[PDB]
């Protein structure tokens, strides 16, 4: 069948110092896919990791192609856009919707950690939605392997986005990968339920962070969050990564298992 390998780039999904992401439509089938275009003028690692990903809550990789200095990564398209845009500033979103998004986020993260991969930059802007509002973890440009041959490798590179980064990243030379992603997910949950980020960064020099450690939950954004989800947040946003709740236990949390959302 001729022409089936032709794709028209009909829209720019995202840009920035790294290249661009275009929406591509198959000339024959009209199938939609996202194409990351990078001017070689990192990539090899991202591709390697993407080839390992196979899960309903993680953006799928279809393959790559290059023409000299330009690389083309074909990825699953998420027409729903960023979870970020579903968050109402200073408000958040309905608790049931946030719980559903959180459930899917955990599934994706559990999967990644299961194959020894850490995303390192979990935030609403990197969590995409498909046509059915199903969450998809995207952009593995900062991801890396933390477990190989069943042996865990401690991390030491500072990666991520300050508001979402765990405190140990700023205070310790080495740290475990998993608690870091757990922390990020907690910040994402906060955002979904309060429509605002708790602090610029998790450091003792940051007043907002000191207040949280001092348990002043009567201040925003904590006061806008119901007691059930707030209790979970008290277990996730724990400064000591060794004391921080793990995913297996998040799955046992009361709010996590609380009936709230009717099926579609």
């Amino acid at each position: 069948v001729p022409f089936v390998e032709d794709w028209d780039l009909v829209q720019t999904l995202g840009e920035g110092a790294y290249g661009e992401v275009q929406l591509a439509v198959n000339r024959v089938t009209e199938e939609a896919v996202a194409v990351k275009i990078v001017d070689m003028k990192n990539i090899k690692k991202e591709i390697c990791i993407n080839k390992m990903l196979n899960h309903e809550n993680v953006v799928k990789f279809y393959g790559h192609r290059r023409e000299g200095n330009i690389q083309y990564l074909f990825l699953e398209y998420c027409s729903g856009g960023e979870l970020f845009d579903r968050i109402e500033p200073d408000i958040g979103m309905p608790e049931p919707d946030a719980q559903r998004f959180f459930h899917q986020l955990m599934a994706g993260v559990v999967y990644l950690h299961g194959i020894g991969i850490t995303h390192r930059d979990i935030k609403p802007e990197n969590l995409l939605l498909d046509e059915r509002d199903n969450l998809k973890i995207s952009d593995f440009g900062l991801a890396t392997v933390f477990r190989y041959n069943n042996r865990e490798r401690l991390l030491n590179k500072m990666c991520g986005t300050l508001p979402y980064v765990a405190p140990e990243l700023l205070k310790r030379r080495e740290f475990h990968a998993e608690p870091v992603d757990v922390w990020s997910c907690g910040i994402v949950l906060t955002a979904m339920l309060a429509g605002e980020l708790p602090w610029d960064q998790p450091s003792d020099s940051c007043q907002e962070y000191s207040d949280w450690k001092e348990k002043k939950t009567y201040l925003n954004p904590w006061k806008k969050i119901d007691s059930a989800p707030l209790a979970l947040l008290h277990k996730i946003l724990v400064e000591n990564p060794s004391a921080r709740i793990t995913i297996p236990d998040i799955k046992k949390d009361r709010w996590y298992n609380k009936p709230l959302k009717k099926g579609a």
């Binding site: 390998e5 032709d6 794709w7 028209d8 780039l9 275009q22 591509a24 192609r65 083309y72």
Partner: peptide, 5 residues
């Protein structure tokens, strides 16, 4: 603009 698969 376009690309090949």
């Amino acid at each position: 603009a376009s690309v090949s698969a």
